[PDB]
Amino acid sequence: DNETLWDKLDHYYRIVKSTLLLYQSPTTGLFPTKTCGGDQKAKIQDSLYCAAGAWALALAYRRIDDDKGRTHELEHSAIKCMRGILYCYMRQADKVQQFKQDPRPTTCLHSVFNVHTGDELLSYEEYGHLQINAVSLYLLYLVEMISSGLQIIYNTDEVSFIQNLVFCVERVYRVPDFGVWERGSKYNNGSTELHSSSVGLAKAALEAINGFNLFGNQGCSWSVIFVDLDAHNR
Amino acid sequence: VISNPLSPRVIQNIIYYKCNTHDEREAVIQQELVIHIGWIISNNPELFSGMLKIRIGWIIHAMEYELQIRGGDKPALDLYQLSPSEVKQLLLDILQPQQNGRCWLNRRQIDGSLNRTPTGFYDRVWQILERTPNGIIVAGKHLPQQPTLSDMTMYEMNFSLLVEDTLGNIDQPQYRQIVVELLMVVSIVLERNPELEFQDKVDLDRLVKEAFNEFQKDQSRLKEIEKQDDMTSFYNTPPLGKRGTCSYLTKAVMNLLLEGEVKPNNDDPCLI
Amino acid sequence: VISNPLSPRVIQNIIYYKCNTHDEREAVIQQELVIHIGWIISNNPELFSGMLKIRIGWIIHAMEYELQIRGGDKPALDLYQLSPSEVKQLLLDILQPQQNGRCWLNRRQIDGSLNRTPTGFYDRVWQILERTPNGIIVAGKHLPQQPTLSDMTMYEMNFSLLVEDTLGNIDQPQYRQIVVELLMVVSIVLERNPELEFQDKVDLDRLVKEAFNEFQKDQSRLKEIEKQDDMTSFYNTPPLGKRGTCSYLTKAVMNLLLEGEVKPNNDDPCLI
């Protein structure tokens, strides 16, 4: 095992570039569910992981001064997805206001989007869009990448939406959801239930995003996110 | 039935408009305990163990009925006259564990109206439901072995609702508690006694009465009580004792099991 | 009774002068069978497992009764016309571990006459003795709990001799087998149920009597049989089945037991 650390990362460089970074959507930064078939469907939850995979290799790529520009290619591969993931949610900011006031399966943020436009693909009837983890995993990952130095939140207007995204996640203790496998339960009757995996992610998301500056090292008192301690406790 | 949680807007119309219209003040007392229950479930979680459902409306009936016992031959205190702490302290007193100084009739009224079931009762009826071909019949409901066994699990939460639905028709609360002990009795019978299986349907009502009549003949031999079709002599009888309700019940379940085939075990060889 | 090893002289004295005097040929046939059992207990001891006491005569009377059964409605072979080769073959046949297809009543002649208690029977009646403080009264002979449990130990021979001596008043071998299976049933009930114990002097003759009562009323109600107090039909009926003798003994044991008080167990407290 005399290979330089350049060599082992190049081994992993290939895999991401050939198997994940080749298929990253150039427009919305999203990651399509189906690599082949022409499907436009991109899910919120899985696309978060794909960016994190490039992020994980990007942090490994922080250990080389001669990265040949690979680190920024993989660091901002995560940013492109998260901002595209961020971009998709505003596109539905009217739903966010409704879900904040009346948590319901018909007012929630969507979970599947057009990989090439970010437009909504399946309606509430077609697809069960109430998936708290996807919103929670976004907030948990968003602070996770920002703390490492990636810059995803760009202006104070995004701060308000992410702040409002907290208000939606603050109420997942009582709002049932379809969960990660978009089925709801084993019976698959379309009836929503409370899931520990979805509920736990929001608790972790609220824990990390509490008091976290979305602007990173370049931030002040107007870029922190405030989390209701009572809502987290419930 | 609130199977899944709703929003403050929705529960408002359920509390006042659609549920209760006989008396508007029913909601005010109704709205009281659900805060008190919230206090207990946090400070004393164990106290609400064994009950699958907290029917507060029946708790009010339990709340008011015990005062009739507490008040005796006197106009009892009105639940709408007590201060909330008295309602809370009343709630703690009669939902305490070992109900104290209650003729076992009053324990059975409180426990039966309270729908307090033994810990693992739902697990044991599943086992009862497992090795019974013709399921369980309770006062005009039928709990079959199929598709119940195939569609559920022994620890499954869905199965618990069905058995309660099977027992939901027991109008008389102390009859329900007698039903569960009978349901317990066969459970403590069946799991220790793995050879005896039912052949026909298990109608607990027939199991309940036949225990009572064979109960009736012994006490008639003692003092010849002239009350007929009165369960009161059975409820004040303690579950465990010289002649306890369980001992009467197991005789009933012993005979019905004994009217079927004694299956020899491959695991346990027979000496005779 | 040959309790301790003896000399040829005293054995010759007992075999002719003391033990048998009604028929001198009884000594010769017992003599043959003693040497035959010496052959068998040396080659294949597994058949002699089960009968503590090997009673030579009983084995003979059993041989004679087996001859009577085989011959049917004919003057059967008498044991003294049979060659010792025929004696040995028949004795093995009745000593066979398993009886297949025999009328259960004939199996009760074979097992009861041989005193073939099933494996561990003495240990099981020991557990019985511990769990009945008063003790058991058997055909006019009583095993007390004390000072019996203190003097002998669980796995020694003297306790076996005592329990067999108490089982010495079973003139009908079939009665002996029915009480042996009664003891096995009581042992399984007691071991399987540690909350409940026997509350009085344990009279197994009464238990078998009311088991016969149950069988007789059941048969009269079902098949309209006009026979009264007939022990044969109870003997043919098999232990394990839809209607079995072990079932009726178990019902008798439970009926007698359930009069007593019950106590929850410390290791596993009853949940109701």
Ligand SMILES: *C/C=C(\C)CC/C=C(\C)CCC=C(C)C
């Ligand atoms: C070997 C299996 C048999 C003989 C089945 C019949 C046994 C009974 C019936 C007795 C079961 C009752 C108790 C163990 C308490």
Ligand SMILES: C/C=C(\C)CC/C=C(\C)CCC=C(C)C
């Ligand atoms: C909670 C249970 C408490 C005592 C045990 C009651 C169960 C039985 C009393 C009778 C057993 C009868 C059999 C044939 C096994």
